[PDB]
Design a protein around this ligand. Sequence first.
Ligand SMILES: *[C@@H]1O[C@H](CO)[C@@H](O[C@@H]2O[C@H](CO)[C@@H](O)[C@H](O)[C@H]2NC(C)=O)[C@H](O[C@@H]2O[C@@H](C)[C@@H](O)[C@@H](O)[C@@H]2O)[C@H]1NC(C)=O
Ligand SMILES: *[C@@H]1O[C@H](CO)[C@@H](O[C@@H]2O[C@H](CO)[C@@H](O)[C@H](O)[C@H]2NC(C)=O)[C@H](O[C@@H]2O[C@@H](C)[C@@H](O)[C@@H](O)[C@@H]2O)[C@H]1NC(C)=O
Ligand code: CA
Ligand code: CA
Ligand code: MN
Ligand code: MN
Lengths: 239, 240
Amino acid sequence: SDDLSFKFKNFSQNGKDLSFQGNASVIETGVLQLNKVGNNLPDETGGIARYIAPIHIWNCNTGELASFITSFSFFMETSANPKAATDGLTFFLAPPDSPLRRAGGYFGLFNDTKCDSSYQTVAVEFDTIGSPVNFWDPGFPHIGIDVNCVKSINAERWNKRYGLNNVANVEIIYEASSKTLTASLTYPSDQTSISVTSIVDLKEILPEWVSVGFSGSTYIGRQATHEVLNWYFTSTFIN
Amino acid sequence: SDDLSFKFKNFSQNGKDLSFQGNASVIETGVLQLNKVGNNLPDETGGIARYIAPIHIWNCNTGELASFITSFSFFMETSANPKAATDGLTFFLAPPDSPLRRAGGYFGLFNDTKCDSSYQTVAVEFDTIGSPVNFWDPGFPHIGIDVNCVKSINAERWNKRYGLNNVANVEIIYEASSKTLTASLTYPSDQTSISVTSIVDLKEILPEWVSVGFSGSTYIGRQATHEVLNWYFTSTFINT
Ligand SMILES: *[C@@H]1O[C@H](CO)[C@@H](O[C@@H]2O[C@H](CO)[C@@H](O)[C@H](O)[C@H]2NC(C)=O)[C@H](O[C@@H]2O[C@@H](C)[C@@H](O)[C@@H](O)[C@@H]2O)[C@H]1NC(C)=O
Ligand SMILES: *[C@@H]1O[C@H](CO)[C@@H](O[C@@H]2O[C@H](CO)[C@@H](O)[C@H](O)[C@H]2NC(C)=O)[C@H](O[C@@H]2O[C@@H](C)[C@@H](O)[C@@H](O)[C@@H]2O)[C@H]1NC(C)=O
Ligand SMILES: [Ca+2]
Ligand SMILES: [Ca+2]
Ligand SMILES: [Mn+2]
Ligand SMILES: [Mn+2]
């Protein structure tokens, strides 16, 4: 389609408009749980959930690119030590048929640290663990923009908080005219706010039709669960 | 979801968001063709096209029912005498995984004339042929409201027009508070407009999640193609 917008005030267990891969699911409370925690899981574990309908991101015949904006609230919980819990969650755009990749520090989107244009993935990561644990990362939790690689083309310092009382407000926007991708995280309790921005041309990275969604991962020993409360999304070619 | 809205200004051949059944498809001109014509087809032939994602129409947890509005423009083409051409098109809500059924005067939605609650289908029909050809219809072309049966509960007379110069603009609305379903057709060339309405409780007829789409069909000897130019749709539980 040319314009598309949906809004989830909460999720339903028996819903039919979401695709799940890995261990992502909707729990009894009406919350989108991106990954599970328990000893019956592999060392590197995670999940993926995307809206069932592909989004027309750019049109080849007219040479046009769409502008979009999304926003959601999330929270995370861990039985281990906050400073050492892995790995985080991401919001991404990739081909509708992409398979679940490797978990852990790879967010289920990548195979390894080598960059490759064949991924055709554009994600905004909420990376909870950095170096020395993940050598390719800065020495602290951060938010960054990834383009076909686990190495962000840009990142910013993030002071991660855990618990339902520490809900985070996220807002991502892509303005096609200026090829600008901006992401901002805000904690409404005390009003702490952080941002990242990069100039990226989606037209030469992604196919015309992509899927929008989330991914969540963790590692054995430092297990943490990532969850989404609601989701709003809207894209248009006329903006 | 709770809210959903999409707009197709035209359709693309390599689109990935429409699901097809039978002989419906998007042609080179960017138009959605519901059925094809030609002599190498079954006697009763037709097609169906639906948006790929199911719509949350009602909620069993809160007892809420959604309101919706949809609009689209369509036109029909025929090489046979217009008066005799069949069978028409349809805008419908049904289980997302329902199969294509009998075409011809049954629009690909039903098996025959028996009414049955298990169809869980509500459709607004733009029926181009009535009795005696179709014994269950009024004796003339008409636009009607079907609830689990090919026989309408209410219908209004329609003087059908064919050709690209006779495009029709349609608007269908379901207002949850009063349970009113209204459909109106207007020919912009001369402002001729007609409408049909009914009051039906969707929670009692449809499942919580349904697919929305169109169906088109025809018969040998009186073939006609039915085409949609654009489509806008929006549903919400939080009606103003
Ligand atoms: C990510 O890991 C995948 C393995 O799980 C790679 O796919 C494998 O690619 C092999 C070589 O092309 C092929 O023989 C295997 O059948 C396939 N394995 C599976 C399980 O599908 C994948 O490689 C990319 O995709 C393939 C299809 C080729 O186009 C390669 O040139 C690509 O690199 C890995 N992706 C990346 C970006 O490394
Ligand atoms: C519409 O035509 C269908 C095709 O014949 C009917 O389904 C078939 O019905 C048989 C007799 O009831 C059943 O044993 C077959 O398994 C079934 N075949 C297929 C391919 O579905 C259909 O019947 C309805 O659905 C079945 C499952 C029963 O619930 C019947 O009581 C229903 O009438 C026909 N009727 C309808 C309303 O679809
Ligand atoms: Ca990391
Ligand atoms: Ca008829
Ligand atoms: Mn990182
Ligand atoms: Mn009729």
